[PDB]
């Protein structure tokens, strides 16, 4: 249908605009849609874009408003004191501010539906909330409404929540437009989604993006597909991938690189209230943090990820146990059988389950998918599904049988409850992935697995060497393969930290020379250098000019193929903030050939200093543009848990950065 009101190009410069005469007598019926295209690249701390209020003495709490915060949060208030109603619905991290230095036109659609008694908010094509209430309050049925306002709310004759921004277009409709109709509204997005709610993964949440440019020109991405909200393991999480064959313009429907089936792949709206938001799926196996590399020799793509058995995460993982038993320099996965108190079994060559107590093979074998076979017959377990119908999280059997896997809660044979690293490969550049294999322990049988550094592994340009960075207490542990990932060895590099989340990414400055940039606990990004293709490592230095929080954030880094200002260039992606995960930047550094020092010369602001920016992935696209896939929210903040579609992709050119 057509709007009852439409206006545009309003400048909001800390002075409200009265549109009462134009709008108020147009409002009819109990359902309304507001469509608003607006920019706010210098917002106040808290400002209203649009208001409908009773401006009279004594009715200060009788208003409807659409508001935003300088955190990027968007929301509404719907208030009527006589009805005893004070609704506030909002979601953090819902907005863009600037892109390539220009103010972003956000497209906001708010639907107030009397029939379904539901309030729904979309921004930039993403539904950020949908709230159903028992007692519906039509936004223009607030008692004594007499003002329609842009850029403030009129309360008792004064301007509250004054805005700085612009509204280039605002339309109102006396109808609750359908989800279909919403989808036809043109957008001016500076970003795209690769993975998103409702896609083939059926995860409502995503974290830990990666990007890697393959030699064919295909760009590959991996990610944590997180089902039980955005929580780290323990949870249900799979590793998903998508690729682009047109320099990042379009992306394939995701497939899984690593998945478990003990719990259903469920699209769930995880609660965000303080009482339930820490609900965590507690009985599922999971994967977490992935990294990609391409091998020149074989042509294969290799993907590593951490693996967590059922109910396990890094916090409750057995730190004193690798989960393997050493027998003559060979390592075998340990297993515990139903009823036993110790691990009296191991998994041997060809997957033969072998009994340690009496040194003999059983009738059980483990197949390639880590599934349990008895006499060659597949054992099964009943799958779980999760729900909040009872008012709290329940995990229960759903009637479906799935192959029995040693990483499962209900399995006859269970692995050690600790963290592992697994590897999978693809021979068709991400169209399909093999069944994963566990990597051996690298620091002894009584040391838990090191933690994979998410992002890219490193393929040395002048050799067949492949390196994946990992970390643990007191060191970075580089995993090195010279044979297409068939065998790995470690190279330990001491770092002056106990228990740092030392997520590290590497760049090859020149042949055989690797600089690794890593997260610390000091508020500064650290680095070290190898000049022998990863065999030995320098002491640790720190970057000045970039700030992180005490707890830190993953940093992504690439060696740019082209010279800049006549010099070799490295590009880092990180939040630049001592306060939270926000103020995202790409920082361009020029290498000094005298000593391999780096002058951090250009800082490109991804969006506002106050808008969220967390884990990130960067890659040089085949056309020499830069692709960035990043968490556009504060993934540390306990206020920004469980948000949909905040991992987003943008395309940049070097001239944008400089």
Q: Helix, strand or coil for residue 95?
A: coil
**Exposed/middle/buried for residue 413 (C-beta within 10 Å: 0-12, 13-18, 19+):** buried
Integer-rounded Cα Rg, in Å, for the chain is 27
* Contact between 284 and 408 (Cβ < 8 Å): no
* Contact between 416 and 318 (Cβ < 8 Å): yes
From CA 220, how far away is CA 226, in angstroms rounded? 19
From CA 547, how far away is CA 553, in angstroms rounded? 10
The question of whether 611 is a catalytic residue gets the answer no
Q: How far is CA 432 from the centre of its chain?
A: 22
DSSP 436: P
Name the CATH topology of 191-319+418-658: Neuraminidase (2.120.10)
Of the residues 263, 615, 633, 649, which is catalytic?
A: 615
Name the CATH topology of 320-417: Intramolecular trans-sialidase; domain 3 (2.40.220)
C-alpha dist (Å) from residue 143 to 22, 58, 286:
20, 12, 52
Q: At 5, phi and psi to the nearest 5?
A: -155, 140
Q: Helix, strand or coil for residue 653?
A: coil
* Contact between 79 and 63 (Cβ < 8 Å): yes
Q: Is 429 marked as a binding-site residue?
A: no
Beta strands in 388-524 (DSSP E): 394-403, 413-414, 420-426, 437-438, 451-452, 455-456, 458-459, 466-472, 475-481, 489-494, 504-510, 513-518
Of the residues 475, 503, 607, 631, which is catalytic?
A: 503
DSSP β-bridge partners for residue 437: 423
CB-based contacts of 639: which residues, under 8 Å, 6+ apart? 92
Match 């819902």 to its residue by tokens. 94
Sheet containing 626-631: give its strands across. 616-620, 626-631, 647-652
C-alpha dist (Å) from residue 504 to 106, 219, 304, 451, 452:
35, 21, 15, 11, 9
The question of whether 156 is a catalytic residue gets the answer no
From CA 496, how far away is CA 541, in angstroms rounded? 10
Beta strands in 375-454 (DSSP E): 377-378, 380-387, 394-403, 413-414, 420-426, 437-438, 451-452
From CA 605, how far away is CA 238, in angstroms rounded? 32
Q: How was this structure determined?
A: X-ray
**Exposed/middle/buried for residue 600 (C-beta within 10 Å: 0-12, 13-18, 19+):** middle
Residues in the chain: 658
CB-based contacts of 201: which residues, under 8 Å, 6+ apart? 195, 225, 238, 240, 254, 256, 265
CA atoms within 13 A on the CB side of 170: 23
From CA 179, how far away is CA 92, in angstroms rounded? 22
CB-based contacts of 444: which residues, under 8 Å, 6+ apart? 322, 326
DSSP count for the chain of H helices, then E strands: 3, 52
The question of whether 387 is a catalytic residue gets the answer no
Beta strands in 193-329 (DSSP E): 205-213, 219-226, 237-244, 255-258, 286-294, 301-308, 324-327
From CA 585, how far away is CA 574, in angstroms rounded? 6
Match 């740019």 to its residue by tokens. 560
CATH of domain 1-190: 2.60.120.200
Q: Is 207 marked as a binding-site residue?
A: yes
From CA 575, how far away is CA 552, in angstroms rounded? 9
Domain ranges of the chain: 1-190, 191-319+418-658, 320-417
Residue of 501, 476, 511 lying closest to 491 (CA atoms): 476
From CA 646, how far away is CA 635, in angstroms rounded? 10
Resolution value, angstrom units? 2.0
* Structure-block tokens of residue 188: 């001016």
Of the residues 232, 631, 634, 640, which is catalytic?
A: 232
Q: Helix, strand or coil for residue 112?
A: strand
DSSP β-bridge partners for residue 331: 326
Preceding omega of 651 cis (within 30 degrees of 0): no
* Structure-block tokens of residue 540: 């640790």
From CA 436, how far away is CA 633, in angstroms rounded? 31
Q: How far is CA 521 from the centre of its chain?
A: 21
From CA 413, how far away is CA 406, in angstroms rounded? 6
Q: How far is CA 235 from the centre of its chain?
A: 15
């Amino acid at each position: 249908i057509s709007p009852i009101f439409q206006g545009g190009s309003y400048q909001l410069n800390n002075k409200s605009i009265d549109i009462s005469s134009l709008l108020l007598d147009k409002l009819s019926g109990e359902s309304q849609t507001v469509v608003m295209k607006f920019k706010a690249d210098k917002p106040n701390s808290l400002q209203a874009l649009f208001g409908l209020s009773n401006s009279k003495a004594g009715f200060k709490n009788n208003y409807f408003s659409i508001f935003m915060r300088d955190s990027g949060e968007i929301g509404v208030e719907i208030r009527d004191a006589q009805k005893g109603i004070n609704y506030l619905f909002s979601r953090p991290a819902s907005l863009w501010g600037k892109h390539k230095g220009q103010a972003v036109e956000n497209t906001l659609v708010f639907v107030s539906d009397s029939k379904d008694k539901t309030y729904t908010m979309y921004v930039n094509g993403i539904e950020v909330f949908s709230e159903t209430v028992d007692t519906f309050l039509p936004i223009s049925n607030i008692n004594g409404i007499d003002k329609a306002t842009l850029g403030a709310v009129n309360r008792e004759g004064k301007e509250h929540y004054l805005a700085k921004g612009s509204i280039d277009e605002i339309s109102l409709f006396n109808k609750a437009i359908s989800d279909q109709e919403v989808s036809t509204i043109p957008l001016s997005n500076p970003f795209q989604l690769i993975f998103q709610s409702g896609d083939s993964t059926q995860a409502n949440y995503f974290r830990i993006p990666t990007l890697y440019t393959l030699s064919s020109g295909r760009v590959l991405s991996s990610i944590d597909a997180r089902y039980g909200g955005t929580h780290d393991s323990k949870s249900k999480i799979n590793i998903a991938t998508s690729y682009s064959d047109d320099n990042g313009k379009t992306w394939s429907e995701p497939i899984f690189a690593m998945k478990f089936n003990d719990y259903e792949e469920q699209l769930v709206y995880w609660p965000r209230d303080n009482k339930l938001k820490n609900s965590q799926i507690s009985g599922s196996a999971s994967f977490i943090d992935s990294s990609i590399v391409e091998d020149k020799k074989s042509g294969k793509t290799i993907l590593l990820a951490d693996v967590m058995p059922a109910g396990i995460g890094n916090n409750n993982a057995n730190k004193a146990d690798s989960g393997f038993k050493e027998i003559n320099g060979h390592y075998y996965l340990k297993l515990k059988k139903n009823g036993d108190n110790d691990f009296r079994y191991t998994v041997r060559e060809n997957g033969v389950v072998y009994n340690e107590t009496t040194n003999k093979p059983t009738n059980y074998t483990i197949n390639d998918k880590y599934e349990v076979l008895e006499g060659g017959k597949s054992l099964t377990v009943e799958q779980y599904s999760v729900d909040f119908d009872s008012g709290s999280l329940r995990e229960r059997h759903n009637g479906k049988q799935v192959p029995m896997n040693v990483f499962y809660k209900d399995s006859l044979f269970k692995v050690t409850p600790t963290n592992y690293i697994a590897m999978t490969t693809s021979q068709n550049r991400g169209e399909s992935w093999e069944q994963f294999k566990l990597l051996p322990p690298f620091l002894g049988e009584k040391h838990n697995g090191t933690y994979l550094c998410p992002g890219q592994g490193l393929a040395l340009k002048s050799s067949n060497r492949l390196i994946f960075a990992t970390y643990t207490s007191g060191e970075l542990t580089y995993l090195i393969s010279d044979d297409s990932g068939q065998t790995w060895k470690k190279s330990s590099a001491s770092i002056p930290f106990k228990n740092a989340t030392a997520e590290a990414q590497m760049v090859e400055l020149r042949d055989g020379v690797i600089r690794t940039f890593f997260r610390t606990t000091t508020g500064k990004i650290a680095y070290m250098t190898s000049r022998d293709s990863g065999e030995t490592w320098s002491k640790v230095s720190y970057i000045d000019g970039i700030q992180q929080t005490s707890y830190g954030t993953q940093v992504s880094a690439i060696k740019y193929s082209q010279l800049i200002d006549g010099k070799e260039a490295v590009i880092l992606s990180t939040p630049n903030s001592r306060s939270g995960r926000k103020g995202g930047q790409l920082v361009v550094g020029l290498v000094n050939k005298e000593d391999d020092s780096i002058d951090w010369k250009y800082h490109y602001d991804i969006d506002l200093p106050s808008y969220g920016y967390a884990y990130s992935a960067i890659t040089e696209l085949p056309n020499h543009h830069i692709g960035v896939l990043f968490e556009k929210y504060d993934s540390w903040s306990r206020n920004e848990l469980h948000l949909s579609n905040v991992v987003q992709y943008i395309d940049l050119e070097i001239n944008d950065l400089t």
